[PDB]
């Protein structure tokens, strides 16, 4: 539940370059696939569950 982003999945470590103002991520099919931790400025990758 990262700052309103309510979703389930496998949070992994991705080498994605996020802009300073960009917080959320998405893809072609309009699905959240990357989030930013509001505590430490790291890059996460929400992936669908198994």
């Amino acid at each position: 539940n990262f700052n309103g982003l309510t979703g389930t999945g496998v949070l992994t470590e991705s080498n994605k370059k996020f802009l300073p103002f960009q917080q959320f991520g998405r893809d072609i099919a309009d699905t959240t696939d990357a989030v930013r931790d509001p505590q430490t400025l790291e890059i996460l990758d929400i992936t669908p569950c198994s």
Binding site: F21, Q22, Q23, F24, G25, R26
Partner: peptide, 16 residues
Amino acid sequence: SYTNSFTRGVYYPDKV
């Protein structure tokens, strides 16, 4: 006077 805005005036619509 007047000018022409060729391809400028585009911003990021959302925060994604």
